[PDB]
Write a protein that binds this ligand. Structure first.
Ligand code: RJK
Ligand code: RJK
Lengths: 363, 355
């Protein structure tokens, strides 16, 4: 008979900007594409980029609390990893050089924590660069870039093959076995990408299984998702000179938001009219040289450009998990009247609350 | 179509532990898996009750057969345990409590297998609590019936399907059955390999594998022993396992002037540790032998030699005859020493120590 999911939840972590290790590029595109594919399969997804050790530990611990009886969970990690004494570790962006196991997340410890859950299906996919829980563990490993090799937005090897099979209505073990076979058919993969599948799945479970809504347990999961996806409402700021500026917000990842400013009305007597954002909380570590760009791409934002209106100034806030209080910042306006030489200045402070992952209370 | 350069298998079943509870399922499970693998054209060596050094030597010699393109299968049934995320196979001489140093680390064996250019490497653990293409089945459980794992495995093993798909079906059958025992499958298989793939020989490498198999399966020829009194006794040999041979005696001819006579075997090498109270039985079952009873003639006396891996030199033993002439009261005794060479696993030259 048809297997069903009580619910479907997923946590995706992509680490790229390492303080003491080579920077990676594939986790950005891989996490974004996997988020959209899992959304088509009706997963409630939280996707985080560039997490420190404590951030990673807190995110995994909170994901594990959602794993009630019958729930389908998926944890995906892309970034640096390593093996030591038969144990594999996920490397956070603040890890020292050389790698110390105390500063990394032990994959085996997470599998043991998952083993204690009564989940319908638990999928743990590691895309690293070097009474049953129904756990399926996909361990993909690739070599680090060659220092003297020639290096757009390309997918990593594993995600390239996984995205072609992930939407299939087949048992997840069968599906991953097909992925391993596709990679074995390619000669370019033969020495640069490996895949090991560990499974204790005893039932025909698939990511496409339907979901079985007003219970407290169900509401807790919906509420965590809803908070993590909450963007500030758009604001129309009215200045004394008559100029009106709209402040817009778009989501790229659960901890990455794009802010844009647009001139909605400029009185005829005003010619120059620059609106820009400033005074961001110090926790976010925003470099002002990268804020107020003429295009979203100049802020390092390539994936949500479709959902952004043109003729704005864009700013990328990419460390929202470090925001411990409300997001308070300033919108400055620098303008010049027709027939006059001096530039006039004005500003207003805005409070847009706790956006996206920050709504879950960061500590 | 995928092909195997050759198909080799080593099956170990541990039951009679010195310091741990005795097990029964490995006897039946090893025997049944041997016959199924033989139908799939595997060259199989199946050993029972191995000590630490015996297990290490057998695994090391099995790993030497794993040349490029070969399909290997290693099966272990017996006590096992997990410690620090590592699993260990427990030999019959292991002390209590368990120790990593006295047991075989499963992960160390997987690492040794990882270095081979095998076409397919299957490692199945049935425990009681150029890629290598490794598929690892890890079954754990907490009376002549099969063990749980082998019961489900034997219904699927002969299928012409990819070994990973086949083991996934086994895990699903156990998940349906209320009776069930856990199963974890670890795989790095990137090609469509199956135990049913055909074998693709006169090369030296091919001949080395055939020779190891041939030696491990060599039984002594049947013998007709002729005694001075005219009595003739036929001595027979049957294989139950690679280290377990059944010996049987029968009176083929008794001269009319001999009113009664009995024959029996004695003086086995001390390495074999044969208890004479268990030898010369009227039925094979009384010797602890019930799997090969079909291939044994009736009305013989049976003796089970079950530790052939401990035989260092030729198997030399005595056939005694006690008889009585018609018209006489006293019983006449006679005996003949018999040398049957090194049978089965003993033909591979058994030694003290490691390597
Ligand atoms: N530097 C400051 C700092 C230190 N720690 N943290 C921190 C604390 C808490 C979290 N919590 C979190 O991610 N919760 C998610 C887990 O994934 C899913 C998946 C599905 C659904 Br439905 C809901 C959720 C909820 C994250 C962080 Cl990064 C910040
Ligand atoms: N206490 C005395 C003592 C100590 N060590 N040993 C000992 C030494 C060597 C072996 N060698 C062994 O079993 N070789 C087999 C391995 O499996 C296969 C599989 C397929 C084919 Br084709 C051929 C073979 C050859 C066994 C033992 Cl028990 C005895």
């Amino acid at each position: 008979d048809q297997p069903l999911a009580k619910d479907k939840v997923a946590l995706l972590i992509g680490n790229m900007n390492y303080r003491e290790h080579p920077k990676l590029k594939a986790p950005l595109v891989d996490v974004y594409e996997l988020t959209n594919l899992l959304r088509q399969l009706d997963f409630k997804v939280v996707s985080l980029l560039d997490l420190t050790e404590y951030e990673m530990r807190n995110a995994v611990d909170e994901f594990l609390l959602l794993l009630d009886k019958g729930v389908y969970g998926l944890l995906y990690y892309a970034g640096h990893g390593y093996e030591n004494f038969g144990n594999s570790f996920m490397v956070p962006v603040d890890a020292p050089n050389p790698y110390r196991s105390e500063n990394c997340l032990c994959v085996q410890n997470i599998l043991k924590l998952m083993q204690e859950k009564e989940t319908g299906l638990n999928v743990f996919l590691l895309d690293m660069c070097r009474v049953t829980a129904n756990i399926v563990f996909g361990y993909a490993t690739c070599q680090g870039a060659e220092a003297f090799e020639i290096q757009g937005l390309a997918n990593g090897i594993f995600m390239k093959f996984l995205k072609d099979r992930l939407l299939e209505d087949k048992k997840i073990t069968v599906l991953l076995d097909e992925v391993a076979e596709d990679m074995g058919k390619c000669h370019l993969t033969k020495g640069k990408q490996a895949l090991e599948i560990r499974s204790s799945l005893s039932e025909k479970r698939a990511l496409t299984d339907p979901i079985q809504e007003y219970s407290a347990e169900s509401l807790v999961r919906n509420l965590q998702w809803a908070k993590a996806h909450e963007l500030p409402e758009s604001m129309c700021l009215k200045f004394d000179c008559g100029v009106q500026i709209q402040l817009g917000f778009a989501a790229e990842f659960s901890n990455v938001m794009i802010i844009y400013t647009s001139i909605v009305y400029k009185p005829p007597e005003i010619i120059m009219c620059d609106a820009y954002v400033t005074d961001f909380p110090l926790d976010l570590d925003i470099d002002p040289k990268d804020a107020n760009k003429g295009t979203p791409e100049e802020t390092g934002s390539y994936l949500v450009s479709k959902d952004l209106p043109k003729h704005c100034l864009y700013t990328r806030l990419s460390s929202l998990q470090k925001l411990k209080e409300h997001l308070v910042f300033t919108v400055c306006l620098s303008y010049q009247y027709s027939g006059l030489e001096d530039t006039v200045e004005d500003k207003q402070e805005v409070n847009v609350g706790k956006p996206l992952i920050a709504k879950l209370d960061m500590h």
